[PDB]
Structures are given as C-alpha cells and as structure tokens.
C-alpha cells in the first residue's frame, strides 16, 4: 500500500509534468499534503505489473485506450462526480472513459497527430503521400530531406495504414467485437507497403525514432515531421518557422489517426482516494490548473469547456481537431494492449525487411 497523506502521480515524460508539479504545489499550500510527479519509462506497462506488490501511484495518467485493461484486472477505483461536475466537461470525453457502464477515470484532453512542416523550406506542404518521394529527391539536392517521424511506435504510422481500410476492432451495436480484426485487409496492406517502399528507396530510415526525428526537424535538417501538440514547445525554443496542418491523403482518402483522450485514474489500493478526487476536480481540471500544464507542453483540446473556448482560437488547435474529425477514437477494451503488441511487431518487421507486408500483417495475431 502507498503511504497515506501524500499523492504520487505517474505521467509520461513527453508531457508537461513540470507544469503538473506546480499544480501539485498549489495543492500542498492549501492542504499541507505533498504531491510528487514521476515519469517512469513504459509506465503504461509497469502499472499492472507492480500492482500486485502494492507499489504504483495513487493517480495514473495515460490515454483512455489502456484503462479498460486496468479496470478488468481490478486495479482502478470507480469515480463518483456529481451531475454538476460532469456538465463542465464535453459529453463525448466522458464516453471515452466509460467501461462496462461505469466511469473509471477523469478525462483531461484530446490528442491527435498533425502534419508539421518548415515554412521556409516548404511554403506549400504536399497534399498527398504520393508526391513525397518526388519532393524528397528535390530536397536531397539541397542537403535536406522531406519527412522524418518516429517509426518505432505504430501510433505514428497507423494514420497511413488506416487511410484506405485498416481498423482495429469492429464497432457495432454500441460494442466492440474482438473477433473482427481489420489489420491485414487490402487497405492496411496498401498503406504499410507504401511506407516500406519509402524506406527501400532511401527516402526514410527504418531506424528513425522519436529523438532522431525531433532533432532533425528542430535543427532545420528535414522539411516535415508528424507529431502531437506536446511537441510544439520544443519547436518554439528552436525558433524554427513551422506550421501545423492536415495530414496528406493516400489514394485519394485522408489519413485516419487514432484519437486519444488523456485521462487520470485512481488506484484501487490507494488510501488517498479522498484527496486525489479533490485534486483532479478542483485543482487540475480548472482554468488555472490546465493552463499551468498546457504552458509547459500543450495538452491539445482540453475536456473542460470553460477553457476550450480560448484554446480553439489557436490555428494549431483547429488543425489538431480537423485531423481528429477525420480519424476515430480508440477503443478502451482490455484487448487493446495485445493489439498494440502485435501491430508494433508487424510494422518493425516489415520496415526492416525481415518480413514482407503480407507476412507481417498475417503474423499480427491479437485474437
């Protein structure tokens, strides 16, 4: 069991945790209870692993897609906010955190990938994936490249795979059917085949990850990248003149990225459910709290209505939502963890030439 009289929080390292830590400081000056913020690596996997030993945080921060597994494993406490509080957040954001008819975390913000480009190197970004190979060879003649993004996580390549037919679990009757997986249909094979061709023709590099892609774009070495709102702060300090726009189309169809809702859950083994509930509702989910976190690393479109009216006026926010409107909200069923394991393995194997596209997508067994 975690110690009583203190709140331990887990949040990913790419988010503005220093801003969240400041929000925890205002909490202690009012209540006298310290708040510690940590960013462990692969925290979305360590939480169900360390739960049996009594460790883990009091509050866990992650996108909504992995919270159904935590609930089915019996690791989350059911939240109970009154009707007046639920009216403060958008209705659809509460749906993302509803599992088996119960609320299992507090929604925070909406995330979606966008296209980021260098205005000086590229005044008009391309509208289609198909013209990127021709644009790369023209930029290579100047010592630059067209596009670099994190190929090690299937979150970043899924928009192209799902562009012409790929999907995770079929949704129907208000429920997901785990026996209907759409990872190896004709559209998914076409999307991944196009990605592999870019690497084979030396337009991209199979070993590119998050840090390499972020450094190349921020240092003016590549013209385009794909990332989320949290990455905007690092581009600002590099004074690069950048834009945020819709992703290019593939075979005439738009890219369909998976939309995530950042959420905060409460540990079932925690004796501080009392304080964690008040911290989330009346200190973080306010105009002051969300702004302290957003000004560290942007959160995206927040779930709190009385703040989104301000953030919506940002063109970068409008671009995030237009990609989100063309995509779909991730499922929250427990099988999503096994889904991401199979898809991550298939993309890496195909991108490195160890398997063909037909072999990798057939090998992705999630049911």
């Amino acid at each position: 069991k975690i110690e009583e009289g203190k709140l331990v929080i887990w949040i990913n390292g790419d988010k503005g945790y220093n801003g969240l830590a400041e929000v925890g400081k205002k909490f202690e000056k009012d209540t006298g209870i310290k708040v510690t913020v940590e960013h462990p690596d692969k925290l979305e996997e360590k939480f169900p692993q360390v739960a049996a030993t009594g460790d883990g945080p009091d509050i866990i921060f992650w996108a909504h897609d992995r919270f159904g597994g935590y609930a089915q494993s019996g690791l989350l406490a059911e939240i109970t906010p009154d009707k007046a509080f639920q009216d403060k957040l958008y209705p659809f954001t509460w749906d993302a955190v509803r599992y088996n008819g119960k609320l299992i975390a507090y929604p925070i913000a909406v995330e979606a990938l966008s296209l980021i480009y260098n205005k000086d190197l590229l005044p008009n970004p391309p509208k289609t994936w198909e013209e990127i190979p021709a644009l790369d060879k023209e930029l290579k003649a100047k010592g630059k490249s067209a596009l670099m993004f994190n190929l090690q996580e299937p979150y970043f390549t899924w928009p192209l795979i799902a562009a012409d037919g790929g999907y995770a679990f079929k949704y129907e009757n208000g429920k997901y059917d785990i026996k209907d997986v759409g990872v190896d249909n004709a559209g998914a094979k076409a999307g991944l085949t196009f990605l592999v061709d870019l690497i084979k023709n030396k337009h991209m590099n199979a070993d590119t990850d998050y840090s390499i892609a972020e450094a190349a774009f921020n240092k003016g070495e590549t013209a385009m990248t794909i990332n989320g709102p949290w990455a905007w702060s690092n581009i600002d300090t590099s004074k690069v003149n950048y834009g945020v726009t819709v992703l290019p189309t593939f075979k005439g169809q738009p890219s369909k990225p998976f939309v995530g809702v950042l959420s905060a859950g409460i540990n079932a083994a925690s004796p501080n459910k009392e304080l964690a509930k008040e911290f989330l509702e009346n200190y973080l989910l306010t105009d002051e709290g969300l702004e302290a976190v957003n000004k560290d690393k942007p959160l995206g479109a927040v779930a709190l209505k009385s703040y989104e009216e301000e953030l919506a006026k940002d063109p970068r926010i409008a671009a995030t939502m237009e990609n989100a409107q063309k995509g779909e909200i991730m499922p929250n069923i427990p099988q999503m963890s096994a889904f991401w394991y199979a898809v991550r393995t298939a993309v890496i194997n195909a991108a490195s030439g160890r398997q063909t596209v037909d072999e990798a997508l057939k090998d992705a067994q999630t049911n």
Partner: antibody
Framework: SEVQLVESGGGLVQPGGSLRLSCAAS????????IHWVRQAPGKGLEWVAS????????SYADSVKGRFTISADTSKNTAYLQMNSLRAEDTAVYYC???????????????????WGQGTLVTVSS | SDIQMTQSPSSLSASVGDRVTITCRAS??????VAWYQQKPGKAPKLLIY???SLYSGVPSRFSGSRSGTDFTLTISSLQPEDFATYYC??????????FGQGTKVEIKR
C-alpha cells in the same frame, strides 16, 4: 542467486497411486507472481503441465493431465504444490517448477517467459 | 488448442569463435511470443531471449534473436566454450498451450 526454487516430493509409486510435489520460493513472493510445472523424461524434450496465478485467480492444465493433477499455492508459506493422482507409467520424468515474473492476464500474455527454474525432482511410476 | 514447434537443424558442429544460427517454426501465427532457453546435461533450463528478440538480463550480447519470414532465429555471433549446449524455443501466445520445440544440439568440432 537470491531468487531460487527448491522442489521436493518425488519418488516411486504404483500405477494408480498418488504423489504431492512442493516448490518453495525464496527471494520473491509467489502471491505477486506465477508458478509453472514442466517435466522432462530422460533424454527428451520439455512439456508444460500446469500453471497458477494467485493475484488473478488463474489456473490452467495441459490436456494430458486434466482430471488427474491439481495445482495450488500457499501464500502464507510461499510454497506451491502439484497433487498428482491416477499416475501412469508414462508420467515418469523429472518435474521442474518455474517462475513467471508477473501475475497472468490473457490481455497481458506478451510480458515474457519463465526466468527462474528449480533443480527438479524425479518421479517414477512402476509396478 | 493445437500447435507444433519444429527446430532446425537438430544438431550442428562448430568451433570456438564461429557464428551460429538456429531456426524455429510454429504451425500457427503467434506474433512474436516466442522465447529461447539453454540447457546443459544435468541442469535446469535457463532463459536467454523472450519476445523473439529481447535479451534477458545477464545474457551476453553475443546472443541475439530475430525473424526470418515466419521463422524465428537465434544467433551466437562469437561462440564461446560455455555456449555449447542444447537450445529450445517456446511459444506462449494465450490462444495456444505452452509448447516447446524438440531442441537443437550444438557440439564442439574437432
């Protein structure tokens, strides 16, 4: 070194007899892990028998031992057991107990394999 | 609830310092839920690789795992005297029971 498993309970019995094996753990807690039983006949390969996961209340058995073997765990003394009833001559083998580091859930199957094994105990079923 | 694990070759002879590669094939798709073990005569198995290519702590970096088509592969880049033993593959995808391969013997060549 600090994590180890010590088995006990093997011997020779008649066809139809019973035996009970033990697997005592040190360096970790069985209640927060998974224990497996794997057997090996002289000069052959490995075959999985049974599995238990205390924290998730999960048990599983191989088809060749269903209705005859029973796996259980005593958390208060950090020991797992394998009750073997209706033994046949073809059950003669060395029996191992191995650890899976975390509790078991079907949607979390991908966390790895068996990282620690015991020394084993010999079981002979003959008339 | 049926699956078969087949290893090739069943035996190979090599010298200290050689590079060696063993292959394993499953009769059903199981993603990369395959592990590799080492066993010497009179001793219990020892875990080397899991998730097809993740090296377990303490295993020297001269071991490595990868994929070749649908097959699983295990490679020892610089064979050492302690590396001579029998190697097994094992699948643990939740849709099929835990199943081992028939093993592969690595003997010293003289």
């Amino acid at each position: 070194s600090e994590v180890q498993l010590v088995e006990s309970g093997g011997g020779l019995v008649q066809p139809g007899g019973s035996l009970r094996l033990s697997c005592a753990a040190s360096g970790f807690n069985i209640y927060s892990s998974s224990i497996h039983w794997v057997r090996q006949a002289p000069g052959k390969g490995l075959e999985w028998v049974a599995s238990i996961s205390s924290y998730s209340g999960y048990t599983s058995y191989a088809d060749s031992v269903k209705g005859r073997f029973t796996i259980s765990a005593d958390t208060s003394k950090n020991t797992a057991y394998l009750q073997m009833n209706s033994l046949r001559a073809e059950d003669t083998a060395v029996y191992y107990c191995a650890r899976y580091k975390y509790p078991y859930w079907s949607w979390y199957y991908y966390w790895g394999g068996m990282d620690y094994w015991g020394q084993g105990t010999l079981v002979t079923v003959s008339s | 609830s049926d699956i078969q694990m087949t290893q090739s070759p069943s035996s190979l002879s090599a010298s200290v310092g050689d590079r060696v590669t063993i292959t394993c094939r499953a009769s059903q798709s199981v993603s990369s839920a395959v592990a590799w073990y080492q066993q010497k005569p009179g001793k219990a198995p020892k875990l080397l690789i899991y998730s097809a290519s993740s090296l377990y702590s303490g295993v020297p970096s001269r071991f490595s795992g990868s994929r070749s088509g649908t097959d699983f592969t295990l490679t020892i880049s610089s064979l050492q005297p302690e590396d001579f033993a029998t190697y097994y593959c094992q699948q643990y995808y939740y849709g099929y029971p835990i199943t081992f391969g028939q093993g592969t013997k690595v003997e010293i060549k003289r």
